[PDB]
């Protein structure tokens, strides 16, 4: 079973799953302290419901919201929009790139307890449990980020829940993440190295895939997008279809960036979270990729990844 | 004009009584108490500790505390309301920003920040209806560009609503002089501003010069030191004729996550009196050095009341 914001589901219920998405990119406490920044909480929720309904009509059945504490995750909002759009949402623990002081000063042992409580007990007082652990690094990995990665590995080893990462692919950041995870005894099959579509260095991706890591080609419309999409085909052609995860990395509201960035983004990708099913899938089909392989990438791979496993 | 917002609603300035103008229920980070209450043992344990502590402060004469925890210090106004009601002590809540703004704050303009502070003063904090009665700002050494936006936004909010501004400084950096310059460039009256953490210095020339301009001087961290040296600064400002410019506090807290683990237990074994330190240890010390009872009531009652009353607009 996979934990979602509406409770547990069987792996067969997950269906076509976008593995790296956000309802809202924000900061801890921000949505509740200043909802007017998004027009209103209601306006944000309604936009997300329409957006999720549009993705559902394009075949999407589940999204993984990889918003951590410090991205302002509001699981109550996730549960509301999930119920109204009839789209499953898996919530995340972990930490991204904006930890406040109360996180930054914690030891690896303390961070492990925090990630564990969000997986095993629930997020805040909601009873909603995280189904994935999201971490992020820059450069060669800062000392704090190393603590985060180790705590994520320890939480994953105790629960079977997978780890997914933010990298700078241009700096081949997955290599240092992989080294830390393997030092902790974490199986690569529990790890998605994310934002991997932001490089043209195929040798970097193939080597990670050959070690058993999942490759998150998760930011396709942030681009040319066809060039990014072709990395999918390249990994298929090398026989690493089982290692591929695809997503949009879209959002319905953003406060952790310049004002009005959401409008720019929406104008550049009007499909929003429907961009993968509406544009990328047809493109890959037009390039000769068969249905069975596209369904394995978008249904089978996410199911294997999210299903809690210690084998 | 004569009413101030507290976490239990509007009150008249007569009810504030003995007021500690820089305190905290909990020193934390946005969202942190709600996401990780076990860090404090539990939310209930933290509330109970605050209630026990505030009740000793009430016994010793405290009627009002100003919790200057901002959004980014993890202010939880619902917690403040719960402990204020159970301890039966007035708590004034703060808006503003301290030293740990998240990206969603750090990327905002002065106009946006002004709107945020105005929302917390004029409409309420989150969905609680509880309005802030003071604006808390913080700078480090030289004001950074973002801190200057925060100070201007604070000045603009203060001028639109009349609520005062209270600052965090490094007094060993004379931080108040650069904060004052910004505030005055915005047309903000020094009588609306408390330059806080001013007891951490020995530079009486710095303190007296700010007082002479009409600023409130926040001698707000007495028990953090010897404390006697810090307390004697109150007397020094009295002796120079600036009784009406002094504000005294403990800058205490009942839980702390914005520091290394176990700092709370060390602070508590150092100052067992908590927020009762001012009324219990410092007030008799000053009277012992010969300061009239009436001067001390002016400092602990009249000075905060004039400070907190929304003034001008
Ligand atoms: C741009 As992101 C790290 O919020 O997916
Ligand atoms: C508790 As503080 C560091 O604003 O004095
Ligand atoms: Zn990312
Ligand atoms: Zn993302
Ligand atoms: Zn301070
Ligand atoms: Zn303080």
């Amino acid at each position: 079973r996979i934990n979602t914001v509406r409770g547990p589901i069987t792996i067969s219920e997950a269906g076509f799953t976008l593995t790296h998405e956000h309802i809202c990119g924000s900061s801890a406490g921000f949505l509740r302290a200043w909802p007017e920044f998004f027009g209103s909480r209601k306006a944000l929720a309604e936009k997300a419901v329409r957006g999720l309904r549009r993705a559902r009509a394009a075949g999407v059945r589940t999204i993984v919201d990889v918003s951590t504490f410090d991205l302002g995750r509001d699981v109550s909002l996730l549960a509301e929009v999930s119920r109204a759009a009839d789209v499953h949402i898996v919530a995340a623990t972990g930490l991204w790139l904006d930890p406040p002081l109360s996180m930054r000063l914690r030891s690896v042992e303390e961070l492990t307890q925090f990630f564990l409580r969000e997986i095993q007990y629930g997020i805040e007082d909601t009873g909603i449990r995280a189904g994935i652990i999201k971490v992020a690094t820059t450069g060669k990995v800062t000392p704090f980020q190393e603590l985060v990665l180790r705590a994520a590995a320890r939480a994953s080893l105790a629960t079977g829940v997978p780890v997914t990462t933010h990298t700078a692919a241009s700096q081949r950041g997955g290599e240092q993440q992989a080294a830390i995870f393997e030092s902790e005894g974490l199986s690569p099959s529990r790890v998605c190295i994310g934002h991997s579509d932001a490089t043209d260095d195929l040798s970097y991706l193939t080597a990670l895939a050959a070690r058993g890591y999942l490759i998150g080609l998760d930011s396709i419309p942030h681009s040319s997008w066809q060039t990014r999409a072709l990395l999918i085909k390249a990994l298929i052609d090398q026989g690493y279809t089982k290692q591929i995860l695809v997503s949009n990395d879209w959002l319905f509201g953003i406060s952790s960036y310049v004002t009005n960035i959401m409008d720019v983004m929406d104008s550049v990708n009007p499909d929003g979270m429907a961009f993968i099913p509406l544009r990328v899938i047809p493109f890959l089909r037009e390039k000769g990729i068969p249905q069975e392989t596209l369904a394995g990438i978008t249904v089978t791979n996410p199911a294997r990844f999210l299903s809690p496993t210690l084998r």
Side-chain angles (χ1 to χ4, degrees), chain A residues 1-222 224-311:
Chain A
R1 308 277 287 213
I2 294 163
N3 285 322
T4 74
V5 301
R6 291 187 301 192
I9 68 173
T10 65
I11 83 91
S12 62
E13 291 182 77
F16 185 162
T17 296
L18 293 174
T19 51
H20 182 129
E21 303 296 335
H22 306 270
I23 298 303
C24 182
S26 195
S27 298
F30 189 88
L31 179 56
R32 301 206 176 183
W34 197 359
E36 295 74 25
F37 183 89
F38 307 94
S40 72
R41 184 181 182 98
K42 183 185 316 303
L44 175 57
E46 283 179 8
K47 181 178 173 193
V49 174
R50 291 189 293 269
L52 291 171
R53 283 176 183 161
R54 191 204 173 153
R56 192 197 196 290
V60 173
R61 294 301 175 260
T62 300
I63 72 162
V64 183
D65 188 326
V66 296
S67 306
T68 53
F69 171 76
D70 62 307
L71 273 169
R73 174 201 62 201
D74 185 333
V75 297
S76 297
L77 169 75
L78 273 43
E80 183 172 1
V81 299
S82 172
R83 289 172 185 283
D86 191 31
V87 174
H88 303 290
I89 304 180
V90 177
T93 188
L95 292 165
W96 180 74
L97 293 179
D98 198 25
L101 274 169
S102 293
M103 290 293 181
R104 305 197 305 264
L105 304 189
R106 305 279 69 84
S107 69
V108 67
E109 294 92 359
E110 286 169 328
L111 295 178
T112 304
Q113 284 317 299
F114 175 64
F115 298 166
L116 284 171
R117 77 97 76 189
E118 295 205 319
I119 300 167
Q120 294 177 321
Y121 173 82
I123 291 162
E124 300 152 325
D125 57 1
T126 70
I128 295 166
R129 285 168 192 168
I132 190 155
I133 303 147
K134 163 73 179 284
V135 300
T137 67
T138 54
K140 313 199 170 305
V141 186
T142 71
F144 182 67
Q145 293 161 1
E146 188 180 341
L147 297 190
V148 174
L149 269 60
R150 293 184 188 284
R154 301 167 190 181
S156 179
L157 288 165
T159 61
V161 159
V163 181
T164 193
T165 84
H166 170 109
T167 65
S170 63
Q171 304 168 315
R172 305 151 296 276
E175 291 168 355
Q176 297 100 304
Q177 295 181 344
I180 293 164
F181 291 142
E182 296 174 29
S183 84
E184 293 277 325
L186 186 63
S187 167
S189 69
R190 293 283 86 208
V191 177
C192 176
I193 305 295
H195 304 331
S196 288
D197 54 313
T199 178
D200 290 320
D201 188 350
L202 179 66
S203 69
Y204 159 72
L205 300 177
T206 300
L208 289 170
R211 298 161 64 176
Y213 288 94
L214 289 300
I215 308 304
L217 299 176
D218 57 31
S219 293
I220 312 299
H222 290 256
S224 132
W225 71 261
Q226 285 104 330
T227 297
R228 291 192 176 217
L230 285 173
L231 294 167
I232 304 167
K233 173 180 190 302
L235 292 168
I236 295 171
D237 288 340
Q238 299 176 330
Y240 293 113
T241 301
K242 298 244 164 49
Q243 304 315 126
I244 301 173
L245 299 174
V246 307
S247 222
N248 311 266
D249 196 15
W250 213 243
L251 309 92
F252 300 112
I254 304 170
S255 57
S256 299
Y257 199 68
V258 300
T259 299
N260 295 324
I261 196 55
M262 188 79 285
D263 292 347
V264 177
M265 292 175 70
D266 285 329
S267 74
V268 164
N269 170 30
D271 296 320
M273 279 182 197
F275 176 83
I276 291 296
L278 292 183
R279 314 298 159 208
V280 169
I281 295 315
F283 175 82
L284 289 174
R285 226 192 292 281
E286 145 210 340
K287 293 306 185 167
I289 304 301
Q291 168 68 16
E292 317 82 71
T293 303
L294 295 174
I297 291 171
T298 59
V299 179
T300 306
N301 295 354
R304 171 190 347 117
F305 182 61
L306 293 165
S307 187
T309 326
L310 290 176
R311 300 153 198 179

